[PDB]
Each structure stands twice: as structure tokens, then as C-alpha cells.
């Protein structure tokens, strides 16, 4: 399975997550893809002569390959619909509010403006305070250590997101300040971290 | 969602993982471990204070650190018994026979000694060739590129495991030579290829 | 060679970097250890048996490994002193006042406290100001990207640092934001930016 | 300084490579290119509007952008003329010879057939043998772990180049089998490893 941990950053927790037992897959042919499901949900997809039907000349998916692949597989009859959601992930935030986790302690739920919403997160970085813009990594979100960012709770409250720290930004040494990075004003609240 | 892909290594094919939106999920604490679950599979836990309860100081899961948080699940009251496999899942293999695809043209069946066992894995690489010791990916490594090798299935034959390439094994630069790695004798057919 | 450029961080600078080209190496063979020179300088050391010297089991020197090739080369006789001061090379800065560079135009001359000493250093990051905290890549200071800060001047000035950006530290993909980075007053002067 | 060890590729020998203290730097300007040297030797180019003098839009020197710079610094008046080795360093060579060293005992000298000349490398690897195909980082070519090959001499006898290993070659795990690698007859004599 996985795990993460990150005590200075967001709390003495471990996050252990679990791949649950999976059936025997079905392979449904047609054309040059091939619709592979366990149970009756579809888990994947082996398109043939990819070349000739996307650009794949560390291939990483883009907004752009998931169309072609997407474009091939309805050619192929199929009517699943790939996820296709390319909104930036790791976005800057303003810490609106910093309350006492009601039973955590060393935890604080936080309310986040993201531009396009509010969110709720529970951080235990010792740094975190109200007025602070920082860079937070939405649902959906993948960290450099592996984890995916899901609709969370932590000890009761939900956390949607994680304020993240230099390490989970991806930065390669281990800095001398492990708490949460705080961005200058200069940073615009809702715009993507990454380029 | 992953994405596989290298024309040179394995074939003119893209594999496309996905991971079926998972339902609501459910918490049950006790103490300081809250196992969470997806309608009645267990998908994982947040046990807190964690640092007093295993040696937490890129965190990966070990045989060892698996045991501390089993320990501590237990004392919880929780019943669920963590997985393991800790067996290598990149090792040396030894290609018996190779044969025509039946209907692909430019990919082979390949029948892999493994040690353990024999895999039939298909493969389209240009320069395999039975007689060859080979570096294998089996069914549950997990590429760099992401992707994490399943009992899958290729046009038709079944495809247990990958036979790697420079890149595969996390080779930073693109090698002038693309094709899968061809081991020396001095390898040892089931041992594993990294310490 | 190496070539480093950096517009937005540094300026709308070429920086070439060569080395000069050596000659003649000499050896000079005592006990274990061999010292080579170049002309009458020593260029390195080629000490045998080192296991038994030092505790050697990507081999990165510590102070402690250059207190063992020391005692060493010394054991075996020879004089020279290997450098071994090993005191953080990016630190926290504080930008004490800025100023148009003479003749540069689109550059500042910065006058940086960093605790021990004020450096003078010529930037070109359009997002500088003064009273900033900043980290700076003291000379001798290794670059990610290869180049090895020294004591240089641009057009005209003095420049003894490098003021650093995302990139700069490490950051694998590239940031929205290229300017510096601007630290919270969070971060202490003089103190080191890695741990 | 760097440090070079590989116990199972190489030998038990450990390597210094020393960066020989130079004094100051004396800077040259003319135009938009200033020539930076140490002593007599140039050591360096600082091109300002470097971007309306060459294409510059992870930076690395190509044949062209040395053309570009080359004919900039021209422009400005100085004589000098860039030096930039674009011959592959790391190759693929024969083992032709494997001997005793004279007084070393668990170090051979090998006489590796490179295409362009033969080269007498002294390796320690206890599973190289004459007949060999190997891949051999010559004079000039940079480690990953930061040395920079150099007309060397072990104990006595001269070496030219190094007998790589998976490590050497930049394989980020820690393979089982330790000594150097070994290539299959595919591979020619000659030709790059890296595309």
C-alpha cells in the first residue's frame, strides 16, 4: 500500500492508503482499442497503433493526448468518457481563518479562499497563520511522494486540499525550514503555482 | 489515470490505466487509528500520532514499519490484517521460447523463466530473442513512468509482466540503443535486479 | 564548458563558464596514498585501500570523510591541507537597499546583509526590493544547473552572490512566478536555507 | 573538490579530484561582451543582450549556440575562440587484453579497443574478461556523481577512461549485480551509448 507522513508540515498523522482486492478483467475488442474492465467498471485501455491515432513521440498526459485518445476510442464505438479535467491542481490560496482543531490540538482547521471557492482544510503546520498566501494542492492533486489528494477528515473534520511545504512542492534537499511555505503578497490568489 | 507508452521497447500500443471513482468513503475511530473504508472494503487508515507508534524519522513502507502500524491497528481493536508482498518485483529472467504473435505481426509471445515460475509475456521489442536473460517487470512492480504492471493482456494472448529497457529501469538519458536490456550471463535467472 | 542563463531571475545575461587546459600530471606515490599535481599544485589524490581509511559504504563528501582522506594522506607522509570548511553556502539575506546600476539600465546593485558580512551583489529579478528577506548563493556556492558562484562583476560592478529563485534551489517544474523568491519574516538572517 | 568510489566497478581506491585555488579575476570589456580570465588563460564570458545575440529561449551549449556566442564575442573584438568538445565521451569499446597489474593484485589492465584508438584503462571490476563488449567513459567525460575523467595513472601504470557500471551510467536504484556492465554483441565498437 501507501503511506505519507509529514510532521512539521501538516501533522504527526500517517496517511495510509490501500488498494482494494480487484476481480478478473474483461477485455472488450474493437478496432484498435481494446476496453479492459474489472467488475462493470472500465480500468483501462490499450489503443493499438497508438501512432497513428496521438502525438507520442516520460510520456505525461495531456489535455491535448487525452483528446486524441479520446476521439479514438469513440471511433471505436465506445461511449466511456475519459476524464478530461486539466485545471491546475496546485494553486495559490488565502488563509482566510485559523481555528483550534475542537478535539486534535496540535491541529488547525483552516478556511482557504481558492478564488473559484472556499476550502476547509485541516493543517498542522506550526508556521500557518490567518492572512497568509500559500500554495494549496486541491482534490485531485498528485504529490511528488505518490499520495492523491482526496476529499479528506482528519480526527472528525473534513479537509478538502493541503497546504504544502517546499518538500511537497518537489524541491530536492531538505530544507532548514520544514513548515509550510508562505508566499509574498506579490502571488495572486486562485493562480495555477506551476507554469 | 496512467499512461504507458514506448514503441521501441514494448510496441505501438498505449496502455491506459484508470481507477473507477470511488464511492463515498466511511470513518471508524478508536484511539488514535481511524480506518476508513469504501462501502465495506477497508481503503486505508490515519493513525495519529504516528511518530509514537513507529520510527517515522521519502517515507517507504517496509516489512518492519508495516508491523508497527499492524501493532497499532490491533491495539485499536481493529481486526483488517495489512497486506505485504515485499518480494522483488523487478528480477532476472530467462527467455525460453519465442514465438509470432498470432494476430499482431510485429510483437512476440515470449514464455519467461522466472525461477519461481514461468511467465508468458508479450513483447515487441525488436531485439529479444529466446536464449537471452532478461530484467522483468512482474505483475505488481511499479514503473517509473507511473504505470503499475497488471495480468493484462495483449490483442488477444495474455501478458504477465514486462521485459524492461534503459528507461524502464530509470535510466535519466534516452540510450542510442532502445530496445530491451540483454543481461550477461553472469546475471542469475529469479534474483532480484536491484539491492 | 557550461552555459548558464536566467533572464527573468538574473538578467538578459550569457554566463560562460571554462576551464583551462591542463597539462602534465606527476604522481608522487607514498604508502596508500598517491598525490597527483599539475605543475607544482596538488589536482587531487588517489588514496588505495580506502575502505580501511574511511567509511565509504553516490559517495557525496562530508566534513567527517575529509577528516579521514586528511589523517590519511597525512599518515602517509605528505603536507598539503585538504579545504574543508563546509559552512552553508545559501543562506537568508536581507536586502538592505537597492539602486540602479550605473550603466546596465534594466539591473540593481543590491547591498545584501547576511549576518557574518554584507555582500554587494548585481541583480537583475524585476520582483527585488529592498527590505526583503531573500536566500542567497554565497560564492563557492554549487549551482543546480552546474556553475559555481564566484567573486565576478557585472559590467562594471562588483557582484558576490547570487540571489536565488525557485529554479535556482532545485524546483523541478518551473514555476508561474520566474522572478526571486521573497522569504516571510518568518526566515532569519545569516541562517541557512537547507538543512 | 569531488570524490569518486566505486569499491565493486573500480576498486577499493578512492579519488580526489582538487580545484586548484585560483587568485583573482581580471575582467576585459568590450561592447556587450566582457572576457573574464584567471592569470593568462581565459576562464570565462559574460555576453550582456545575450538573447538579441543568440536563441536562448534547463539551458544546454549545442554546436549552434556556441556559433552564436563565438561570433558575438568576435564581434566585440577579442580574438579568442571557443572551445567546445561535442564528441561523444561515453562509448562502447573492446576488451581486447586483460592482465595482471604489476603490483596491485586486484586490479587488471585492460586494453580496450575504442574504433577511433585503443585505450589502456586499468579497472579493478572482478567480472570483466578480454572478449567483452563495455561501455567506456573516456578522457573528458563527466560522471554523474560529478568527477570528470582524467588522464589518470593507478599505482604506477597509466589509465585512460573508466569501465562503466549501471551506477555510473546513471541507474538511480542500486543494482544486485555490482560489477561493470556488460553488452551484448548488438553493440559496436565505437559507437555512442547516449543518443
Do not use: W
Not at 484498435?32 to 490499450?46: A, K, L, M, P, T
Not at 485545471?87 to 478564488?115: N, R
Amino acid at each position: 500500500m501507501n503511506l505519507f507522513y509529514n510532521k512539521e508540515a501538516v501533522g504527526d498523522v500517517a496517511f495510509l492508503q490501500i488498494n482494494p482486492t480487484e476481480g478478473e478483467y474483461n477485455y472488450v475488442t474493437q478496432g484498435d482499442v481494446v476496453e479492459i474492465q474489472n467488475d462493470g467498471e472500465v480500468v483501462g485501455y490499450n489503443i493499438f497503433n497508438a501512432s497513428n491515432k496521438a502525438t507520442l513521440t516520460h510520456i505525461k498526459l495531456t489535455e491535448t493526448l487525452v483528446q486524441a485518445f479520446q476521439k479514438a476510442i469513440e471511433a471505436a464505438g465506445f461511449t466511456y468518457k475519459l476524464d478530461a479535467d486539466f485545471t491546475p491542481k496546485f494553486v495559490v490560496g488565502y488563509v482566510e481563518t485559523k481555528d483550534k482543531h475542537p478535539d486534535a490540538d496540535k491541529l488547525s482547521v483552516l478556511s482557504v479562499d481558492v478564488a473559484t471557492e472556499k476550502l476547509q482544510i485541516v493543517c498542522g503546520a506550526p508556521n500557518v497563520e490567518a492572512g497568509q498566501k500559500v500554495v494549496v494542492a486541491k482534490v485531485g492533486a498528485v504529490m511528488p511522494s505518490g499520495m492523491v489528494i482526496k476529499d479528506a477528515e482528519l480526527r472528525g473534520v473534513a479537509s478538502s486540499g493541503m497546504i504544502c511545504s517546499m518538500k511537497e512542492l518537489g524541491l530536492p534537499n531538505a530544507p532548514q525550514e520544514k513548515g509550510i511555505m508562505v508566499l509574498s503578497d506579490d502571488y495572486t490568489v486562485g493562480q495555477s503555482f506551476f507554469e
